[PDB]
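Why run this: before we spend reagent on co-expression, it is cheaper to look at a predicted model of the complex and decide which construct boundaries make sense. The entries below are exactly what would go into the expression plan.
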Amino acid sequence: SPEQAMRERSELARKGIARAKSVVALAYAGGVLFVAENPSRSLQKISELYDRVGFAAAGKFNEFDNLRRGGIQFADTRGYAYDRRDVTGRQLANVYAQTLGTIFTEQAKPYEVELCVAEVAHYGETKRPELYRITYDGSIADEPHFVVMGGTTEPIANALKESYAENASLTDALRIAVAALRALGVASLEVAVLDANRPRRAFRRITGSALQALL
Amino acid sequence: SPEQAMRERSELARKGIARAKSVVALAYAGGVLFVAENPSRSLQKISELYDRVGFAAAGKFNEFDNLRRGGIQFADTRGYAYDRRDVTGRQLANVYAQTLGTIFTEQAKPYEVELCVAEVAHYGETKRPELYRITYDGSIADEPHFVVMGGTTEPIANALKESYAENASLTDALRIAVAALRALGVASLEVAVLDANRPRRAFRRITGSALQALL
Amino acid sequence: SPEQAMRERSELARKGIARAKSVVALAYAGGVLFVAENPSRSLQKISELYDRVGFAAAGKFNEFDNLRRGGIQFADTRGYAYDRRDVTGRQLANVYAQTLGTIFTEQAKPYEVELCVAEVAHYGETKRPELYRITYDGSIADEPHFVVMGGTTEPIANALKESYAENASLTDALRIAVAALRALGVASLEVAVLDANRPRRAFRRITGSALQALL
Amino acid sequence: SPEQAMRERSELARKGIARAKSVVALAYAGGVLFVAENPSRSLQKISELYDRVGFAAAGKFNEFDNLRRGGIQFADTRGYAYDRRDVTGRQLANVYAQTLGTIFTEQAKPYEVELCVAEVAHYGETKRPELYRITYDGSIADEPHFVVMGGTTEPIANALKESYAENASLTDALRIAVAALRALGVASLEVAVLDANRPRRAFRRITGSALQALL
Amino acid sequence: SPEQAMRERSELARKGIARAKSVVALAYAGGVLFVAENPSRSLQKISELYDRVGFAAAGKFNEFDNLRRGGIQFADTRGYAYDRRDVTGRQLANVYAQTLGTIFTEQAKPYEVELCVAEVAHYGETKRPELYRITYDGSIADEPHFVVMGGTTEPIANALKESYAENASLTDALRIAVAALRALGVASLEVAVLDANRPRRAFRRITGSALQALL
Amino acid sequence: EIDDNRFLEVTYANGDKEVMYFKDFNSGAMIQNVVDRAKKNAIKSVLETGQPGLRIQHLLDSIVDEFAENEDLPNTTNPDDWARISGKKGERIVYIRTLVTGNLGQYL
Amino acid sequence: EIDDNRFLEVTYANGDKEVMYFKDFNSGAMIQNVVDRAKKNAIKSVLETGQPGLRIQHLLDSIVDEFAENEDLPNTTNPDDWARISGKKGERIVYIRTLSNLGQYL
Amino acid sequence: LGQYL
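The model came back. Tokens follow.
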């Protein structure tokens, strides 16, 4: 029966994403901000994908780090084969959607993962940040303001719905994101930005004492 | 019993096409017009296939985009192997007729897709637009006037049956197609044409302010 | 038990041939005449195989067009490997029989097809037209006068049994064949001949206004 | 069950062997005579295998023709690899036995075939004709006088038992063989000989008016 | 059922880790100390992995020695491909986690093993020892002070919790580790250190009379 | 033979969807029930409005009500029909659906 | 339609997740149980404070306390009654959901 | 298969 078992994975996967930590990504004046609840110092859930494309995920790590690696592979092979400015967040999001769909209908177990691909404009350029959410189905959604992944997403999504403000500075967006995430110190937070002002590589982690000052 | 399994495959494919947006393609004075109900700005359901051959689809995105890519591959390999004017809409339709049959009988789940291949005459040439509809069965129907794909096709097909007029201009055919499709603004419509007057590449999207003026 | 499962396959292939249009092929003064009931303008059920060997079929189109292509492949590889006058209708018929038997026993679903291979003599030569019918299992039968394929074959076969006349002209054989087939205008008929008088390529379609005059 | 397979496969193939026309092969003064009941003009059940080795079969045409082709292949590869006089009827019979045993145990369906390999002496040489019968399982039997294959073998075998005479001429052996086979004109008989008097190629068909005179 | 297979795999591996001797690893002034209860003189459960990276395991000997070998392979291939100071305990731990996440879900029987990867700083450098524990599921835990593997971990862990002291000398940490392990002479103990003071290769076994003096 | 008389559609091993109207479940008992319901409606009309007699429109309304009241009868399996339909069809009924009344992947 | 009276979460064959609130399960026996629980709360209030009265807040709290104890309105797997609601919906009901050492989750 | 020598 296609209905019982192709759907059977959908509950399985939904359950796996819920027994994980919560991640948020939101647009602010200087680009995009990723704020994840992460206790470990070695294992991460936020990553650079390409010059202006970042990536956050929530769910089984062996699976979303597998996707992290695959996406890095893809982006670099394209950038070298054509050029750096040709790889876009949109292509990456689409590849992740195809790949998560193919795992959903073929592999034994569906990837209990939820992805967010983020993109900002190039240096000295003007364009709105783009956020995409890719689910375990292979579904892809275009988000204008923020993405919330993993755990219980309702309270965080609503708190962000009240607190969100376009063109908020880095400190305000960090306060809003940590506040809505609570609905945690520098020893339990993974924070990075897609700073639109950087010349080439936009991704930049905010850790330690600098993070301490920001929050 | 393969007699019963085939029946559940056909029903599953039919439900998937019904559980999707609606696309129409109709002949007008300057060629063929594709009008689809599409909210996303990145994901598209209308595409150039070859110089004078266009393509619309309705069903599961990843699958009809798989077919989109396969068809592009095919057409370009032929055009280079023989010549550009040898690739015809008829060949393309036939290839998607046999690929969807093979998928429908051999793969685990049948593709839930409905295809429409369109062709117009070459530049300075005279010939009637040809529309073909390829179903998940692999059946190919030759349409003289318009094709309606995906969702509930009856009311749209009837509204077009009353409003259709051969040699309608671009604006009239757009009004007729949007009206019958309603049975939506520039932010929820994907509109493109196979303009028979272009010298080589006939496919041409109509978006933004130009689309705004046309409708 | 294997024989009983084979009985289930025989019926399924027969049901597909029954759910289809009817084709006739008969001998007349100038060679052999194929007359098929075919509404489409792109999809064809009559084809040239080699210089003097023609082919008609009735059943699922994807499967008898697969056979059409395979037969073309075979005939040309032989003609080039040895010579043109070495490829005979008899070899072709035999290959189709072997292939339909292998398909009927080894593949999941039997080809719901019925084939007729026709051959005439070479130019300036004298010899009677040969008709062979190959059925879905691999059986092959030698016909002296006419072959009827697909749909309900009894009334057409009997009407031909009363009307057939050896050495009938092209027009009389066309009238007899259309009459017995009715037991349809140029917009619903596919008509071709294996004209024994042509120097090399004997197959020749009769369409449009010339067909209009003949019938 | 191991017992079920052997008893059931045996019945499935003995049925299909009795479900076919009858062939006889008998020794006469000039060599060996094959007389088969065969209505078709293209499909044959008697064949040359090598210079002095002939072959007759009864069962399912596609399969014993597969064996016919395999045997030809074998004999020619040996004759070229070593020499012509090294290929013997005994080797051929043995290969057919190995192959029919392997088919009978390993393939899905057993070959519903019955084979007879015949051999005569070389030119200007003296030696008795050898007849071997290979059955569907791989069994091989050495016959001194005649082999009867396919259909109901009892009445034909007995009629031959009363009528057989060693060193009978070609005409008498033909009368005896046709008579015992009846227990049919030139339009329903396939007749050939392994004429021991020919210099190299001993196999020779007797068809048409010459056959008419002989019978 | 994915849930029943997960709860069955999990309770068998765990019935193997607790079905084995106990190993402890703890930080002390000169680096990290491994103390395992091991009767054999040839079979070892503590091993050098790379210059500053050590390895201890508890479970099924053939399997954790398989992992021992794979890790050695990995570390040397990296060290040669890039450089020695690029291979870190963190990479190794991560590879073991991916491997124990793939074995557990894909192989027939999960590996019944518990791993501990240890790392110290380079020579003349200052940095805290890092301990990671990889479970048979594929989870990795960052430990600040000590890891206990195999057998009855909870009683041994309770004793270490009371006796542990940072910057304890080699003799004190050995007394604490043997004491908590008892909760055994040089003929039943496997003792090795990751001595941070060594110039390059930090791993060093303590056996025989030197071990005798230390305890 | 109108859309109003379409009761149930039936799928089989072949799976061809064959419509079953109310006429396939008509019986003398149903006819008597319709007549009795029409008589009750006529008596109600006499009680309320005061005009005596029987009307054809009462019969039509009774037919409509009787047909609409039997929409919950069908179930997974129904005998007394299989030995008449699965014969000419040649395939056993595997599914029955009531006709017109009133994210598992991405589907652009 | 506020998310304070959530009762069940149903995922259909189409994959559409819908929250069925109490509005689709207001049986008369459920109303009786609500009233009885409110009266019990009134007993507790009058025996705690002494004032002989019934508060509207008693019934308001009993509304949400009614489903703290199961009423047999939800069922395991797919209920036959749900197959009836699913028939009205036109989409087959697939998931009923009320409202360690197994790998690593981040 | 009755072929036993």
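Chain D has one domain: 1-215. The helical segments of chain D are 2-18, 61-81, 89-106, 153-163, 170-182, 208-214. Bring this page to Monday's planning discussion.
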